[PDB]
Enzyme design. Structure first.
Site, PDB file in Angstrom:
ATOM      1  N   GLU A 242       4.124  -5.656   4.017  1.00 17.87           N
ATOM      2  CA  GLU A 242       4.099  -5.183   5.392  1.00 17.87           C
ATOM      3  C   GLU A 242       5.445  -5.504   6.028  1.00 17.87           C
ATOM      4  OE1 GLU A 242       1.381  -3.659   7.248  1.00 17.87           O
ATOM      5  OE2 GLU A 242       0.751  -3.265   5.184  1.00 17.87           O
TER       6      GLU A 242
ATOM      7  N   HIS B  84       3.484   4.053  12.442  1.00 10.30           N
ATOM      8  CA  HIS B  84       2.714   5.197  12.934  1.00 10.30           C
ATOM      9  C   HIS B  84       3.420   5.982  14.042  1.00 10.30           C
ATOM     10  CE1 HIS B  84      -1.032   2.568  11.755  1.00 10.30           C
ATOM     11  NE2 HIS B  84      -0.242   2.829  10.727  1.00 10.30           N
TER      12      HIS B  84
ATOM     13  N   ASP C 107      -0.432   4.429   0.751  1.00 12.74           N
ATOM     14  CA  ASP C 107      -0.931   5.423   1.695  1.00 12.74           C
ATOM     15  C   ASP C 107      -0.347   5.242   3.092  1.00 12.74           C
ATOM     16  OD1 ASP C 107      -2.603   3.039   1.877  1.00 12.74           O
ATOM     17  OD2 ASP C 107      -3.886   4.199   3.224  1.00 12.74           O
TER      18      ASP C 107
ATOM     19  N   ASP D  16       5.871   1.531   7.416  1.00 13.11           N
ATOM     20  CA  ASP D  16       4.477   1.216   7.124  1.00 13.11           C
ATOM     21  C   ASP D  16       3.868   2.181   6.108  1.00 13.11           C
ATOM     22  OD1 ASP D  16       1.749   0.474   7.180  1.00 13.11           O
ATOM     23  OD2 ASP D  16       1.893  -0.103   9.287  1.00 13.11           O
TER      24      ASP D  16
ATOM     25  N   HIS E 221       0.821  -1.206   0.000  1.00 15.74           N
ATOM     26  CA  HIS E 221       0.000   0.000   0.000  1.00 15.74           C
ATOM     27  C   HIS E 221       0.859   1.262   0.000  1.00 15.74           C
ATOM     28  CE1 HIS E 221       0.413   1.190   4.258  1.00 15.74           C
ATOM     29  NE2 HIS E 221       0.359  -0.098   4.548  1.00 15.74           N
TER      30      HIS E 221
ATOM     31  N   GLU F 189      -5.583   2.058   2.603  1.00 19.72           N
ATOM     32  CA  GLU F 189      -5.460   0.906   3.489  1.00 19.72           C
ATOM     33  C   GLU F 189      -5.323   1.345   4.945  1.00 19.72           C
ATOM     34  OE1 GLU F 189      -2.709  -0.226   5.382  1.00 19.72           O
ATOM     35  OE2 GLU F 189      -3.661  -2.105   5.992  1.00 19.72           O
TER      36      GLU F 189
END
Ligand SMILES: [Cl-]
Ligand SMILES: [Cl-]
Lengths: 361, 361, 93, 341, 81, 93, 341
Positions: free
Chosen positions: A151, A329, A73, A95, A71, A126
């Protein structure tokens, strides 16, 4: 369109730096997608946005397909992009633009046998949203023959799947009184359910050093109120499950642990796992060792595209990518440059190894 | 202890008036229990509070047992107890002191064959709390051979079980923008899920006049918020299920109805039902008709002790009692005096009819 | 690193445990120290989670308000304990 | 390499009142990351960066939060103005620079902490360290001691809240009752502390707010009181006294910490004295009126502990809080000499 | 005047802690008819006094209750409230 | 007197004391000057603390509504005093 | 059987300000249940009791809610004081008694409604009837017409909210802007309604509250305005005007209803006139200044509709709202004669 460059020329660190520079929180991936499609086109892919705006670049030819599903995003916010002491800081470094960058480069380096396609996808929405990217792929594309999820597993780690998730709610109502003995109030009753359930989870998984093979509880919320006649209390609890503990099993324990209250339960994620003996796992274990690593089989805790395309397509599936997932994050999300290229070399072999399995048929 | 009176002497209306007079919201049933135990002792029962303070009175002798499982507690508040134009007003008149009173009287009138016991229970803490009454019975007593639940079915109605319950949560997150087109906001998205799901439920159960054989949805809560970057929305929905629509079926529809959002689901109650052909049903259908009624087979919507002792004991089970259940928990909860005695006569025969089945063996 | 509700529940357990350990064997409540968790509420605004517990401490003669409060204050690891004295135990011969 | 002064204005230019430290913390960590620290915020939001390797640890514990109020960030002839210039971004910036400048032995790691919520009663930034970290071998608290000053201790702190209700009819107002409570408390402390030389040894109550309101049928009044305690008077004792003066109202109390002091002849003190003295300074050992996170990590950890940093503590919380830029360079070098020894 | 009667009226006036004035009023009104000098003090305490002299016997009770109302009724000899 | 609230309280204490000293030796309440602190409020914006006191005076004919203000004014060494003369005392001969 | 007067004090003794009608509704239904009505509250909390049998329905629509304020419930020489004695528990009690007293033909059912929230702008009590009930054949609104009065109509209602913000620095205060808006609105209405005889035909604005506040950096002010409209000026038109006078602030508007009036020569009017006249009265047909739920159920249902009840409407919302007890007995009997015809 840029001139064709050597797949060997561009390093993953080089591609990631450019990719991590462009802001792309969920919903706003368009400039990032356009850029990456150009880059992939330069690397020998046939690259173009699909219906949902997912970045898609293809290689090879034939009736067989290996999809690398990542992903593009991220969560919002800008981690100050900087490279210091062989470490790249940036939003999505782990991530999951790191794994995505690895996908692009390794995919263009990988030697393919005849009859094998290679589709690399930078999916959108996502991270913060409901995965419009992957759901569009399922609705519009044939199930590929193999899927690698982008991932962070670490360069020397391979993810076989994810732990099951259960959301618990304990609720209790008791008549008001003046007493101060044990279990006098609803809040005390809700709190003690937490303790006794928390105790059980520790009992169940005693001595287990494999954290993803443990059942670990979480008290997300506890609240209480009263109308002068009755007191009420609610405890909201999350339960992350190992493969050997099904929801209905864990839900039965919680139910049995509650006497004066009632427990309701939602299964957020059924547990999911590609078996250790499977060919795709053999390929990645071999690929890691072929490049000087001691591979670790592990499961992801958090949800991902693996939670969707897995149950949908049912094909053999693993998750692989450089980076420490604990940094997901985070305000200083980062990845070492060495791990990027190391993971790139490994995935290059793994793609070749999987394609070899598929071609042998 | 009062002198033994004739079971025929005391009418159900007489007993109910005394019973409805004493306040007994959940948790505070003690004076009501003491009073009823005295009354039952006078009617030929051997009556005494058990471990959980449930009122328990027994008749007969033998290795077989018919339990009449009612509850003595109510929601709080006093419906002004009055009898006007053949209608008795009072808290619990319908839910569920009426059915409980019927249990006591009919049980003392019923002719028992040898080898058959009859246990009448006025359970506590069913209405506002987590049914300490019934759970205590399960934990301390042997499963009886037949169970009648004291809930209002109407004198000419017989309840075979209850509808399944499903709690749905739809959640959606979308990036903020300036647009005003359809599905521009999370709230619009959450609202439209409600419409399309509400539409489906109507589609599914078209033309079905048997309401308990319909799937009926409810929007209990809808909320939305925004952080300036993203907007979020949540719709909390209850689904009451007919027997021919399992939770996982209904949960699959909801899941399929949502695209941009994600649906999670809790099954509050699995559906439960004693079959129409079963002996206990035959007894009650016969009993109603024997006293000039046209019996209706129905299901309860709301939860009760039937939701607990049913799955626990697994014995044949029905719910029977005079009163209109729509009047449950109402400021002027009431029941006609005629329905009480009519239901008493019917249950008297039904107990005899069930005991006859059991004795024949 | 974990939740506010968990940290507040952690405080209650500590206090409940301490009071219970102090009160072992004592038959009459008047000579026992017993806590009462009247309320426990957590919240989340998306930025910070917060948890508030409201507790009533019942005191026997052998335990002064000053000492109990000192004990309660010492039990809190990361939270903030706030205390108000009504009165100490009182009896007449 | 970046000087402490260029580091300070950048930090001072980023507002971080208690509760809103995240952007400051976020920015500080990348400044620590760029400088070579392994740096991220921890579980409580503290800015954390750590140096070296091994099982032995020195901690430079400062705080990144400030009291509110906008002090215009500017330089006026080598004088930097701004909220936090003295209390306590100055010392914190000094920690970041001197912490990297110094050279360490093997087995010795250095850790810089920009804690949250030091200024307010929670002190949860420091409390998270106590809860989630092993006790270091030594601690330097980041408070303004002056470039040639060494703070050995701070007073304890207890916050008091008086609330009183009176009917809005007939018979003392809520305001009068609250004021007289303050009068009693103020007098008790003044009579206790009479003729005592320095603020450190006195007990001093602080009426931060008194507000009376009319509920409608009731008169209401509340008084927010901060109380600063000497070693001789514990939080426990001070609350008992406060309780005994309540009368018609109720007193709600929240303990921060008791007073704390570092013993004057400690080796860690000698290290700083030398660092001051050898850098051409005339050190004065100080004990301060306010409180600190020293008062928490001190009794918790027990390791050798002192407070050091550029800045005059009298300018704390002032509308034009400022520090001479010259003081920054010396304090960085002095802390370094101190760190090494 | 009987105790049960006064109470029956007393329990019919809701007086949760902090909202006592109505009950306090009514009670002061009743005590006068019994010989007291009744008056709410500066706090709102219902105060009834009778007689005089150097000494005093105080009957100190409270008028406030916890919230949550129990429907007021007398059943089988027992008063609920 | 380091905060605004402390100064307003101090003005009140000193005003209350002055009135009482003046009113000493007086038989009836209506001949004494009586101060009443109706309200006392304070605030802060980070830079400055502010406080305001609402003090009522009941005046006998022996003390003028002008002598009252001047006295109050002189007590405000740091603060500021504003006054509303509703009415001076009247006394039928 | 119970008289209207014994019924009234019981209802008046039970406070039911808008939002808190439940205990009053609860008690009223048992009074209706004891009297023989099939009676429970409905989905909105309205007190509902219905008589007779069949497909034809007369509705006695009153309201059980009152404005706030405690009016001591007492009888002083045949005069009952209390909040709701006139507006509108008096008429509602009259409905309950006369509604049972009268004898009906077969196929004709009578229904008594003690609606919630009539006094406030929501009028949701009546709105729930419009949403959940079939239109009756006739309606009697329970408002004080006087024992010898027949109200044929009420003015419409629109609530207005003006809010204005001004910085707390330099350059009109929030209060001044809000006041001048009121001045403009008040003048527009006065110049429109100039020289008009009765209140019914005038447009009259009502400044219920004006409050200015200091945000901190902004000056704030809000004005709560009720506006009463004649038939000639619709809610829509009145809002357009209100909008055009906003200038620096914004106007928020909420429509209750337009004006409504029952045509003077209706058979339902004749029935009440006769009931008044035949009972020795000299009826005066009235049009009232305030509004009613008549203004909602009227245009909704369209059936013959009037307002009748004991009480002088000038006493509405007053500190000593009261009605002579003599007026109650006559109004009950008159309503009965009216009901029959
Ligand atoms: Cl000294
Ligand atoms: Cl006119």
């Amino acid at each position: 369109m840029l001139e064709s460059i050597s797949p060997m020329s561009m390093t993953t660190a080089d591609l990631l730096r450019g990719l991590v520079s462009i802001p792309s929180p969920s919903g706003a991936e368009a400039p990032a997608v356009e850029w990456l499609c150009q880059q992939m086109a330069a690397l020998g892919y046939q690259a173009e946005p699909d219906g949902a705006g997912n970045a898609v670049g293809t290689r090879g030819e034939g009736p067989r397909e290996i999809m690398l599903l990542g992903h593009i995003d991220t969560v919002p916010g800008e981690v100050p992009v900087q490279v210091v002491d062989g470490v790249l800081y940036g939003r999505g470094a782990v991530d999951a633009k790191g794994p995505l960058a690895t996908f692009v480069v390794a995919g263009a380096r990988a030697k393919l046998p005849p009859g094998v396609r290679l589709t690399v996808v930078g999916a959108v929405e996502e991270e913060v949203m409901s995965s419009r990217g992957a759901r569009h792929l399922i609705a519009t594309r044939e199930a590929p023959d193999a899927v690698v999820i982008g991932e962070p597993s670490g360069w020397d780690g391979v993810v076989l799947g994810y732990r099951g998730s259960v959301a618990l709610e304990y609720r209790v109502t008791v008549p008001m009184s003046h007493s101060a003995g044990p279990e006098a109030t609803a809040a005390e009753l809700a709190a003690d359910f937490w303790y006794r359930l928390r105790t059980w989870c520790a009992e169940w998984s005693v001595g287990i050093d494999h954290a993803f093979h443990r059942v670990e509880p979480k008290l997300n919320a506890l609240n209480s109120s009263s109308d002068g006649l009755y007191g009420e209390a609610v405890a909201r609890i999350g339960l992350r499950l190992p493969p050997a503990l099904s929801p209905e099993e864990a839900i039965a324990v919680a139910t049995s642990l509650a006497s004066e209250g009632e427990v309701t339960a939602t299964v957020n994620a059924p547990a999911f796992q590609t078996d250790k003996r499977q060919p795709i796992v053999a390929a990645f274990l071999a690929a890691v060792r072929a490049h000087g690593g001691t591979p670790r089989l592990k499961l992801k805790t958090g949800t991902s595209d693996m939670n969707l395309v897995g149950p949908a397509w049912g094909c053999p599936i693993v998750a692989y990518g450089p980076g420490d997932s604990r940094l997901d994050h985070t305000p200083e999300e980062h990845v070492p440059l060495a791990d990027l290229e190391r993971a790139t070399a490994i995935l290059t072999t793994a793609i070749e190894r999987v394609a070899a399995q598929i071609h042998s048929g």
